[PDB]
Design a protein around this ligand. Sequence first.
Ligand SMILES: O=C(O)/C=C/c1ccc(NC(=O)C2(NC(=O)c3ccc4c(C5CCCCC5)c5n(c4c3)CC(=O)Nc3ccccc3-5)CCCC2)cc1
Length: 551
Amino acid sequence: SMSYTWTGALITPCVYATTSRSASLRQKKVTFDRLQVLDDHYRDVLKEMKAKASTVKAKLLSVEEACKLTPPHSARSKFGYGAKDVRNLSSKAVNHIRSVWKDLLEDTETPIDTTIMAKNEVFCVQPEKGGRKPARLIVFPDLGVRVCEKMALYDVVSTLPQAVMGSSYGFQYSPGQRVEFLVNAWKAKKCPMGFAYDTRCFDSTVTENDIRVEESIYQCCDLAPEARQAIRSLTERLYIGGPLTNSKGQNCGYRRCRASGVLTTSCGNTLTCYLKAAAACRAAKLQDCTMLVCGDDLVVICESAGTQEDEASLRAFTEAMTRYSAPPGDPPKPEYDLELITSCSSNVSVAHDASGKRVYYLTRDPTTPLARAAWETARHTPVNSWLGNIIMYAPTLWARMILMTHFFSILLAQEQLEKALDCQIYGACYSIEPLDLPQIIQRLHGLSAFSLHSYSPGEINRVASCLRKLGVPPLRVWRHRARSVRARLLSQGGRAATCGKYLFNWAVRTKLKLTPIPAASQLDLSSWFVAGYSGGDIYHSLSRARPRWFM
Ligand SMILES: O=C(O)/C=C/c1ccc(NC(=O)C2(NC(=O)c3ccc4c(C5CCCCC5)c5n(c4c3)CC(=O)Nc3ccccc3-5)CCCC2)cc1
């Protein structure tokens, strides 16, 4: 079948930002027929995955529990209620949610309607590597269907990927734990070889069989009878496909591939990518494979068979993935240094802590983080990528010296340090106060994240070149700015002084001891690095369990 079918009605509207004006360029790329051929390797891996899914017991969420997972700014329903009414358990919201649920139990076939829209993402204007990127399209069902998805599948998509893929499931790892996994896997090989595999329009390559095989994995869970029917009905009416409706309410066509804005997008993509890749590893006869999968993002670490043999096994891996309908964008290349593998646009780098000890950490090219941060300072935005980047890339030179200094200077000026802000972590939305950042960083990266030095020449040059390219003042200006920022924060006491002392210890001439923050342990981070939820429409507010009067 065709991944998509179009009527001709436009995808109407809701350093550059991507708009609906480029949607036509994306539509051309994502529209094609899929030719999938399965084999014994695929069926074997699938049976192995299902045997692991069999150990899972999933709970049906109540209306109230599902309502609480709804983001405050989640797209309103076309049936006269919004995200605020859902969160407050309003009579109209709850009634419509209960009628949608009943309809999923009684109707097993009628396709559910979805909205199609162009995503507005900020990217850096690079004329050296061609031109602008067309907008990525987002396909999502109505708010009421989105609440029912959580009731039926929130526990499944949170528990199942880990039970099935084990250590291969990328979203169970904080950036440091991801780093620890890769270092340990690389060290485990006599002669290691690693590669990243990028699929061209992964969502489009997802066939209805891929989606039915994904349900066969869900059906291995211990499920409540109504959860079982809702999964069956949601697969048939929503997940395999359905009609597309633009922002103006006009028919845009149809979809027969993965919808990017459903709860099962991350889980489904991860299970599908793992299945195809694990099977392809066998077809290519790659020895002692270790995989790390995050949706469509795959990294394979294996035992090298020699330079020529490694290139031949990669073409074989690619031939198998292509048969499974997962062809590459850019063909994969073998790497023989862990630092050379770029996965989720990130790479491993090393530094030293205060005592000269080596510390591995995850970094990335800072152009997009800085360009998006510049856009976010220029105009008000719903989600703050700057906050998510400080959290995830806390040990990096660029997040410490530029993102922290810049945003703490703004927060000091606006007197908004205590004001909670929304950020994205593995697709889920988190409401976080900037004052909690020292504690969040200590928990995810360790106390060493505040003492790191001896950055590599390559990492330093990438940062310095990026600042020049973007017209950002040099690193010496940032150290000078951080000293004033730090001084002002220190004078305020409490969590504000903790921000000063810990986040900006790199800026002082002499450098302080830095003892662990005692209130860091109180932070409830139980739901943080469990699963991926991109497109899932998931929200969580940061909570502090058992506070002490003096902390
Ligand atoms: O050689 C020396 O001894 C000193 C050199 C030197 C050079 C430039 C300055 N610049 C400044 O003071 C001003 N801008 C900045 O002090 C500035 C701060 C952050 C900037 C950012 C981002 C960085 C990440 C957080 C969000 C802001 C960008 N740009 C920035 C400029 C340059 C800019 O204007 N825009 C962009 C566009 C895309 C990406 C980044 C930027 C403020 C008043 C005049 C311009 C200061 C000192």
